[PDB]
Design a protein around this ligand. Structure first.
Ligand code: HEM
Ligand SMILES: CCCCCCCCCCCCCCCC(=O)O
Length: 407
């Protein structure tokens, strides 16, 4: 077969589901670079993808991703009891009280940032979200962050996810940002261990700095740094979902009124933003043993990718996936495989995102502020979603004018 890397990079969110549509199947064999790859979509495929007796992650992460988005030595590259033990470290951070604490810090940072937006007269909403998120998450995680460094650190965290997938010098910026953020986070871990930094016992940086592995050993400082960045970075990446919240409010008739007056609506709305909008395209794993599934061969070692966007738009599951309809979540049964914007399966026993509770809480803050507190004008602009960009965004970044919060 031919190499389809270029076709995938040209349409990273939709390539798999479009090919599935042409072939009338939920899976097809392709090739990306040197690797034959089985591409999978839909709930049944997701359930097999999360079977850890058939799939492993070790060695599946490309070097370019290790050098930008994820770092080296983090939980994403682990399998088995080594994985489960490291994953418990992240899961223990996510109590309802701690998630609420982060949401509260974020609301405060957003409110603190508004006067600056008012003074600018016109803002790119996406561009303005990274710093308040950075300030909130650093405070919550026990990471000291001087006021005069917050903007710089927010730009570095942003570069890890926003510039990683850019076929331009921006990718070089992402690589430098990774070197810088790893060094910074390592100084934080070192300071906590030496007693020069007094992060609290319930904070992420404390938990990670003092985590003991399965041999009762502390994580090496670099690995601890990477795991701390695995909390900070994706929290800043919620900027993308917050921008999509503003986009849905602007482009979908009836949503604003429903959010303002119906109190149970916000939970449905945020879930539908996660279902509808492209963000995390797909996940990669490797077959751990020979098997066949639905007439397709999965030889030991076969690279496999699971299409999250395509799964979230599977008409068999959703019936009318092309519409933005928060109401659809009234009928959801909380299946762990059929709605997978941040992965599928079980949080403890697999690689599913431990950040979902944070994401939902922060999205609800955003929805509340954009309809109940923050007044703004939206000038004529190109709001269409850029499906060629990683992460996807409205092409304009969502431009606002005359922003204020006294109204
Ligand atoms: C901003 C939107 C986010 C999206 C779209 C997202 C999506 C994902 C996805 C698709 C995965 C991989 C699932 C897999 O490998 O099977 C993942 C893993 C992960 N996410 Fe998120 N996530 C987000 C936010 C967060 C937040 C706020 C945190 C804060 C702790 C977080 C921490 C992690 C970690 C540590 C993993 C690796 C878990 C593991 O490998 O066991 N994420 N996320
Ligand atoms: C030069 C080729 C590399 C391509 C890199 C593609 C990476 C896709 C990342 C886009 C989604 C970003 C979501 C945030 C992820 C997180 O913070 O863990």
């Amino acid at each position: 077969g031919p190499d389809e890397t270029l076709s995938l990079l040209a349409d990273p969110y939709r390539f798999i589901s479009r090919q599935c549509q042409r072939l009338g199947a939920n899976a097809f064999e392709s090739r990306f670079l040197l690797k034959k790859t089985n591409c999978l979509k839909g709930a049944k495929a997701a359930e097999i993808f999360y079977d850890t007796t058939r799939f492993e992650r070790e060695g599946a992460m490309p070097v370019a991703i290790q050098k930008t988005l994820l770092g080296q030595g983090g939980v994403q590259g682990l399998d088995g009891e080594t994985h489960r033990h490291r994953k418990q470290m992240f899961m223990g951070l996510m109590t309802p009280e701690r998630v609420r604490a982060l949401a509260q810090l974020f609301e405060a940072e957003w409110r603190r940032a508004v006067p600056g937006w008012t003074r600018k007269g016109e803002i790119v909403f996406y561009d303005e979200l990274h710093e308040p998120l950075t300030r909130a998450v650093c405070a919550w995680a026990g990471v000291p962050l001087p006021d005069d460094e917050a903007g710089n650190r927010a730009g570095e965290l942003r570069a890890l996810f926003d510039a990683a997938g850019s076929a331009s010098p921006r990718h070089l910026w992402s690589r430098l940002a990774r070197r810088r953020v790893d060094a910074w986070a390592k100084r934080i871990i070192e300071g906590i261990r030496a007693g020069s930094i007094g992060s609290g016992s319930g904070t992420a940086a404390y938990a990670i700095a003092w985590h003991r592995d399965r041999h009762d050993d502390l994580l090496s400082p670099h690995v601890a740094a990477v795991e701390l960045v695995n909390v900070l970075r994706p929290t800043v990446a919620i900027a993308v979902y917050i921008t999509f919240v503003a986009h849905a409010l602007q482009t979908c008739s009836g949503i604003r009124a429903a959010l303002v007056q119906q109190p149970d609506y916000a939970e449905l709305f945020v879930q539908e933003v996660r279902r509808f909008y492209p963000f995390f395209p797909a996940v990669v794993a490797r077959a751990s043993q020979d098997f066949e599934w639905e007439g397709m061969a999965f030889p030991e070692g076969r690279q496999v990718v699971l299409d999250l966007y395509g799964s979230n738009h599977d008409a068999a599951t959703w019936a009318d996936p092309q519409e933005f309809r928060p109401e659809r979540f009234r009928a959801w049964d909380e299946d762990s495989f059929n709605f997978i914007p941040q992965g599928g399966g079980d949080h403890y026993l697999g690689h599913r995102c431990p950040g979902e509770w944070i994401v939902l809480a922060i999205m609800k803050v955003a929805a509340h502020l954009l309809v109940n507190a923050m007044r703004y004008d939206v000038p004529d602009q190109d709001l269409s979603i850029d499906f060629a960009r990683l992460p996807a965004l409205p092409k304009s970044g969502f431009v606002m004018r005359n922003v204020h919060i006294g109204g």
